[PDB]
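Follow-up to my post from last week.
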Amino acid sequence: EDESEALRQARKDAELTASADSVRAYLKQIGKVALLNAEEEVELAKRIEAGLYATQLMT
Amino acid sequence: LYRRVINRNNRLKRLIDLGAPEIIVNNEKRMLQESVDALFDNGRRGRP
Amino acid sequence: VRLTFADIELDEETHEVWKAGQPVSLSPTEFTLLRYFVINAGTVLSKPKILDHVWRYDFGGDVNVVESYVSYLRRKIDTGEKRLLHTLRGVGYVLR
Amino acid sequence: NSVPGAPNRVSFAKLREPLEVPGLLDVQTDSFEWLIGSPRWRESAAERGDVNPVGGLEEVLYELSPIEDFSGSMSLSFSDPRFDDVKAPVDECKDKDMTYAAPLFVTAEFINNNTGEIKSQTVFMGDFPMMTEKGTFIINGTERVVVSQLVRSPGVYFDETIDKSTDKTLHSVKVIPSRGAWLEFDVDKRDTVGVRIDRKRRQPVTVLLKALGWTSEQIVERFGFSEIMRSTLEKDNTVGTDEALLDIYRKLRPGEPPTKESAQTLLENLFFKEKRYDLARVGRYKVNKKLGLHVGEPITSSTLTEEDVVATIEYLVRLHEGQTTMTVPGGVEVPVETDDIDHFGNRRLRTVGELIQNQIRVGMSRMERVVRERMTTQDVEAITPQTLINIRPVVAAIKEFFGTSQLSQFMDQNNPLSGLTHKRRLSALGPGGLSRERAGLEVRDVHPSHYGRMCPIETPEGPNIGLIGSLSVYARVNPFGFIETPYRKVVDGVVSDEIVYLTADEEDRHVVAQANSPIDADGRFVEPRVLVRRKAGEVEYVPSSEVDYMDVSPRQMVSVATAMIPFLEHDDANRALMGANMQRQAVPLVRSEAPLVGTGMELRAAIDAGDVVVAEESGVIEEVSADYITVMHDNGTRRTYRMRKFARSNHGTCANQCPIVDAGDRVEAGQVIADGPCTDDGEMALGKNLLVAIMPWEGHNYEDAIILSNRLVEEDVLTSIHIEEHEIDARDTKLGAEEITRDIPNISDEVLADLDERGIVRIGAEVRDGDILVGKVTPKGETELTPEERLLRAIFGEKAREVRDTSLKVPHGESGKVIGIRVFSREDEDELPAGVNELVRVYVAQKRKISDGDKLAGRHGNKGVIGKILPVEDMPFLADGTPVDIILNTHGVPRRMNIGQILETHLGWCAHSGWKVDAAKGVPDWAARLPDELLEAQPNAIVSTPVFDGAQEAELQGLLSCTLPNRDGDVLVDADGKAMLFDGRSGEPFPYPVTVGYMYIMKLHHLVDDKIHARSTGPYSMITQQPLGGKAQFGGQRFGEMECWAMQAYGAAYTLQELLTIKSDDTVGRVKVYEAIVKGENIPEPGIPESFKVLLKELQSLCLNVEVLSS
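User reply:
Got it. Predicted complex:
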């Protein structure tokens, strides 16, 4: 079923697939990153603002 | 076919000169490779 | 054998132009320009057409000469309320 | 005769048929009536299968409705598809390039369940093209016919194969549904049973059965005898419904992680949900009948079902075990046997209605997608059905079918036979069927189920031999698209008058007798053993008390064109095929004399082809002219039939119509009023009766050539009207507007004499090659003026001539008179393509006389070109002095086995001369069974020989015996059909008598005037400088690889060099060779062909470093 090495190897072998169609391959590759929410996006904005400010300072 | 190849190449060079995630850049590179393969042989690989 | 377009009446043999009974004296260049316009009513004539026919081929100058002459003809016979000698930008001129 | 105005046609038929030929356009008319939903079809469904009368449009509407949102609180539905009066009459639509169409409206219901809202609107669905009363569509002024196509019916098919490794007998089954994913089962070389699904070559039946909610215990309980797949189950190596589901998921959908619920929902969605997989109603019926599932239940839930799948598996395993009968639980007992893919019980016929319904289905699928998107996007409580529906996909789809689809073709109308044969034709190409690149010889063969369904003689001869045929004359289409044919039934060995229509499915379950069987006027056959067709297509003898069916008539197995071949049974199969194929290429002459010998089919063919005006209501005829005929009906009203004259058909032949009635005679309903192009007195007449001798003459009829007298030229016996149309359009352009005007620069005056002030040639002004039909002058301005042009206008006084003359000139190689002109312009409200302000079409006629090189043919496949036209004096003439009209070689008959043409010759002479059988002491023995009213015939009589109940040889010999003399007492033709001829050149009598008679000869549409081409220098292609090809361009012959091989075989090198270099590619070589040949010097050395340089640059552009090395 779910545990005892039952379907994890199936998921791994599924992810290790050619997927010769480029659109399907792109969808597979885009599938590996989780969605965000309001909090995560706002602190990401804080981080990029800090990076831009530091880059301007070094310039 | 030539227009497709030119569009893909120009978009790729814009992407690399602007800075983008490697997955985006790799998808663009795969598109460019498929465009060149379509130019020489349309349908030799995958659907034409 | 009289060249006509609505208002404008050009006669070759007697060499003057009428605006519904209004004659006006024109320069020879402008006269040839008007004549070879009127015989091509409703048709676009491009700048090389104009220069090669009205002027001689060996005209080695710049083109705005025809621009000035079309201005002359406009202020002379187009001076009525309606505009006849219309311009198509980058293409040429048509009387219509 | 059963036709009020029929001319008398004495017949040699011995037997009386029970039922008359059906309406020959039923195949198209009934299908379109079903699609639309007319009250006539309503009554037809009421009298036959009233359980569920639903039209095609109603069915697609009811299937699409209701369209739901994700919430489900509001929905849309369609109902009541109604039509409206057509836009314009057929003649008007054909005249002004419209489309014979009608508006369509649908009563859309938008419902809202959250609060309760009903919105009713008559939404305009578009302008549906309509079908004329003659079964053709009018599209942009062209007559188009949608030919019915043959496709395998969706369903379940079993087949058996030999592995050839161990001679093991393997069995496979395919469930092939229309618009779905395939299902497959088979038995492998070993005992394993494969269920490769959707082209995934794994999964024995164990995993599928387990994923279907079944356990191993249930499998062994239900399926116990199947030791083969019981062992397969023992090698399942996968236990658990969830395990089987995940295995199926990870096979069919790689790259995605299986879930507990996605597996179940995908397995259900693949087949058991009609949104993604549905056999049509025909497919569901086929599966139900094959497996005996439901026999007293209506058709619904067209998608596949789990018990259907398990029944399929049970059938397959029982078949492989060698069984012969199975009874599915809850289902009726049914035989177990493999299915033939080419049997006409499985090859269904997609007709016009079905094709139109499918295209509508595509359009409305796009409709549903767009409306669901817009109904999600737009705000609720402010939405309307009008704001939701956007008919553009539907109208675009119907247009995209009706134009540019190989199942919709120009209705070729050389003659009414060609039209009627283009309709009622069965193709096997197009989308959804096999193609010429795919055809198998087994497909091209003649299946025994064809008898009475599709003709085995009438078919195209070229590469598509066997893929196109014609409906049998008595055929009909079942409501499910299966071809069925009538047959009588015999009870107690006595034939009833009861007629039942039988499909090829039930024919195998019966033993159908023969049409021409020795009936006893009571019901019984004289001989106990009769020759019949059994279940497997075999023919055998059977005791009379055991047969159960009999043919309705002879010619049941034959098409409509072939049924017009006299003495068909005396002709070989392929020669009869050629004759039937040439029957439909005969051009319409100026007279169209009815044949002396024929069959009874010509009358009905001419009536049903729609090219002959018929009195739709009985009444007297008030007045008649050359264009209109007015009839005074009984009930006060009067009717006027306008008669089309000299209208050009799609293939450039005249379509003149002429009245055949008087000014006071009464006519009945259905009687011919005015004959058409190829008709005489209302019966089809494609040629002329010619006096023929069958001796070889001086070698001018060598190798199938034909000789004729010059009186055929003089009397216009063989002459035709050929009308040609030419088009030119004045269209706006960047520099202004082209104008059609008689003022055209640098032109002479005599060539302008035939041009009126409008700029178009006067009607009636005769024209020849190189002349101007339309003086159309275009605005060009000026170009590079070469010094010589300036010098010329200086020396003589040539003016500006600013415009260019792209005038309409007659194409090279024809002439003739001008009939009429149609002129279209936007200033007269006329609708024109955008950018065109004036359109002109010019019609030119040539009265083409018969000449050498033209192709003549009989009705028996005896074709040939005209070797020589001979002066009337230099022809063999009988002792009476009448010259023969046509001479055919005698070496062509016995080699090709078409003696039927000679039989026709003898009977034609007999019918031309008349006869009287002397009944002094009873009738002679041969005339005992010969019908009355045929013992005595006046000169120039007309006789009908039905194709298989024809005139026997003994009867024909007896008729030839008594052949009453012509003018004085003289029997020119002796007992054996021959006669003595005088040579018109040397005068001495011919040493031996040769046969003479009257034969029906027709002129085919292969006139040398349309096949003569020559080219010296013309256009060239762009990419490579090769000359063009075809008479449309200026042509240039193809010197192929085989011709190159022949040239090398001769050892001739210089002419090969010249044929490849300075005639086709070397541009400098071409110009230089033309200059050299005109000036008078020897031809220069050829250069390098341009095509080779093109190849060099092409290979260079493929990243290949290819170059030429000089040392």
